[PDB]
């Protein structure tokens, strides 16, 4: 899944 | 202590979700919503261990190719309709149907379900998919190769059931708040775009008797410093993942017991558009990889325990242990940088005529910091031969730009969907629906293809090491680091460990204590 955060 | 009489929680979800239809999305903000509204065959606890979901029991043939799921005979959707094996057939067929244009269409191909790839290619009709309702409460999955990790794959958002009768009647509009029907622990109470999603208990959920939280709010706060300030003011109970690097050491000491963090099955990269000039040139992709100093980003920009990496798969994932970091990563920077400069001059770049591109990223101050640092290193390290701009887009827009190929270089971050190396390896298949880099090498496809027939873990692990070697020699992307998942969590929130390898968060696993 694509992670929005860091 | 004891349980609070009020069981309400506020969580930052970080972005406005693209959609609440799991066949339309590929991101964490989206999955975090879906997992509250819908439940697949199997689900998990706070540490990511498997437990019964829609299926109360299941079994596999000894060859790991046939998987049988026994659904709950009395289970209902939130509108009272029965949950049946036909809902799973319907949903899984809709996921691979090209007409759905699902970002995770390929997930059923990863599961090796019979005919999934042909259906995604339009060669067979979605009704040819190798899944069946043997009766109303018996769902059977037929795989063409051994998939001993199948049950874990079934926990992913893309394999959630949909309410067939509702979706067939309303089409894509089934997702509107007035129409949404699900079989998870919650239902949608309110949705204000860019502001909040409100959840309320789904009393028809088969395990409602064990759900504690009565209501919850997801916020859409994009910047970590804003998240942390809201938390400090008492207006949210759990941040999203990610904390301001400048505040991290202090937060840990001041809010001792509230900062959760561990290493994560995630990889942060700049994805290069392999079909857009000039990133279709391996020489240039190589120069960018050589001249980016990962340690600057992990030690000076971030410093939160992110570890540098030069490959896509985290090597500590299950069956990832044979994957090697590439030899250039062991060269001094001065050597790497001279090499990069030669490559760029060979490609016609100079100080007067630099390589110019933008880094596309989703609005988030931490992504900005990393992009500023990367732009700065690429320029300096190549003595002026690269000149980089930043392009920040809102999440939804960023996602669409990546999928459309409207980018040169894009900030990327892939989280494992299940704890086995192929959740990464499968991403770069030439025909993967997840592959927005447009990377394609038949040798890569073959190394992964040969892994799916392997009978044992070592043979799979060798094949993954080879795939990574090919992707690395192609410089298909720019891997930067492996993630950690720092979050602030109030002391009165229990049931969160952060130790779930998939980093799922289920409201039905949380509870609020008092004193």
Query: Could you identify the residue written with the tokens 């622990």?
Result: B185
Rounded distance between C-alpha atoms, residue B358 and residue B371, angstroms: 10
Smallest CA–CA distance, residue A2 to chain B, in Å, is 4
Rounded distance between C-alpha atoms, residue B353 and residue B467, angstroms: 35
**Contact at CB, A2 and B370, closer than 8 angstroms:** no
Q: How many Cβ contacts (< 8 angstroms) between chains A and B? A: 54
**Contact at CB, A3 and B241, closer than 8 angstroms:** yes
User: Which chain B residues are closer than 8 Å to A1 by Cβ?
Assistant: 26-28, 31, 157, 414-415, 417
**Contact at CB, B364 and A1, closer than 8 angstroms:** no
Strands B196-201 and B355-362: unpaired
What the block records as the tokens of B122 is: 């339009």
User: Which chain A residues are closer than 8 Å to B486 by Cβ?
Assistant: none
Query: Could you identify the residue written with the tokens 């689900």?
Result: B43
* Helices and strands per DSSP (H, E), number in chain B: 16, 21
- The residue of chain A nearest to residue B369, with distances taken between CA atoms, is A6
Query: Facing residues of B43 across strands?
Result: B51
**Contact at CB, A1 and B28, closer than 8 angstroms:** yes
User: Which chain A residues are closer than 8 Å to B436 by Cβ?
Assistant: none
Listed residue (B92, B178, B103) closest to B128, CA to CA: B92
Strands B355-362 and B386-393: parallel
DSSP string, B153-176: HTTSGGG----HHHHHHHGGGGGS
Rg (CA), chain A: 5
- The residue of chain A nearest to residue B221, with distances taken between CA atoms, is A5
Rounded distance between C-alpha atoms, residue B181 and residue B441, angstroms: 42
Cis peptide before B278 (omega within 30 of 0): yes
Smallest CA–CA distance, residue A6 to chain B, in Å, is 5
Taken in order of first residue, the domains within chain B and their CATH numbers are 1-38+164-265+485-515 (3.40.190.10), 39-163 (3.90.76.10), 266-484 (3.10.105.10)
- Interacting residues of B117 by C-beta distance below 8 A, sequence separation 6+: B109, B431
User: In chain B, how long is the greatest CA-to-CA distance?
Assistant: 72
């Amino acid at each position: 899944g694509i992670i929005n955060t860091l | 202590t004891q349980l609070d009489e009020k069981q309400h929680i506020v969580i930052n979800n970080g972005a406005e979700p693209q959609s609440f239809d799991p066949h339309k999305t590929e991101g964490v903000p989206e999955s975090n919503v879906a997992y509250q509204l819908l439940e697949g065959l199997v689900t998990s606890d706070s540490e990511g261990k498997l437990q019964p979901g829609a299926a109360e029991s299941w079994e596999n043939t000894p060859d790991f190719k046939t998987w049988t799921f026994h659904l709950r005979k009395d289970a209902k959707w939130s509108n009272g309709d029965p949950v049946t094996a036909h809902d799973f057939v319907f949903a899984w067929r809709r996921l691979v149907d090209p007409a759905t244009a699902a970002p995770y269409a390929s997930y059923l191909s990863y599961l090796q379900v019979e005919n999934a790839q042909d259906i995604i290619d339009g060669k067979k009709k979605p009704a040819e998919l190798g899944v069946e309702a043997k009766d109303d409460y018996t769902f059977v999955v037929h795989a063409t190769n051994p998939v001993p990790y199948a049950v874990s794959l079934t926990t992913h958002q893309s394999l959630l059931p949909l309410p067939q009768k509702v979706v067939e009647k309303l089409g894509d509009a089934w997702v509107k708040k007035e129409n949404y029907v699900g079989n998870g622990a919650y239902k949608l109470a309110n949705h204000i775009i860019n502001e909040k999603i409100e959840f309320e208990r789904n009393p028809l959920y088969w395990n409602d008797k064990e759900t504690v939280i009565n209501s919850a709010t997801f916020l859409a706060i994009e910047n970590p410093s804003t998240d942390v300030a809201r938390y400090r003011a008492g207006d949210l109970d759990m941040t999203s993942y990610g904390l301001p690097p400048e505040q991290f050491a202090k937060l840990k000491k001041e809010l001792l017991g509230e900062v959760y963090v561990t290493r994560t099955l995630g990889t942060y990269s700049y994805e290069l558009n392999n079909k857009k000039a000039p990133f279709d040139n391996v020489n240039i992709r190589k120069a960018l990889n050589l001249s980016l100093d990962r340690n600057v980003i992990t030690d000076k920009v971030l410093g939160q325990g992110q570890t540098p990496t030069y490959v896509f798969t985290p090597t500590y994932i299950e069956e990832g242990h044979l994957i090697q970091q590439p030899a250039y990563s062991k060269e001094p920077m001065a050597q790497r940088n001279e090499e990069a400069i030669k490559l760029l001059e060979e490609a016609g770049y100079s100080k007067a005529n630099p390589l110019k591109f933008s880094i596309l990223y989703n609005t988030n101050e931490n992504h900005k910091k990393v992009a500023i640092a990367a732009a700065s290193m690429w320029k300096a390290n190549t003595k002026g031969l690269i000149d980089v701009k930043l392009e920040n887009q809102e999440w939804k827009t960023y996602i669409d730009s990546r999928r459309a190929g409207r980018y040169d270089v894009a900030r990327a971050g892939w989280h494992a969907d299940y704890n086995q190396a192929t959740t990464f390896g499968n991403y770069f298949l030439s025909n993967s629906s997840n592959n927005t880099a447009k990377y394609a090498n038949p040798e890569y496809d073959k190394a992964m293809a040969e892994s799916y027939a392997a009978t044992d873990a070592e043979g799979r692990a060798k094949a993954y090491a080879k795939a990574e070697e090919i992707l690395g020699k192609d410089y298909g992307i720019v891997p930067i680091f492996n993630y950690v998942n720092p979050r602030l969590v109030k002391p009165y929130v229990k049931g969160y460990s952060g130790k779930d390898p998939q980093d799922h968060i289920y409201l039905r696993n949380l509870y609020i204590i008092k004193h």
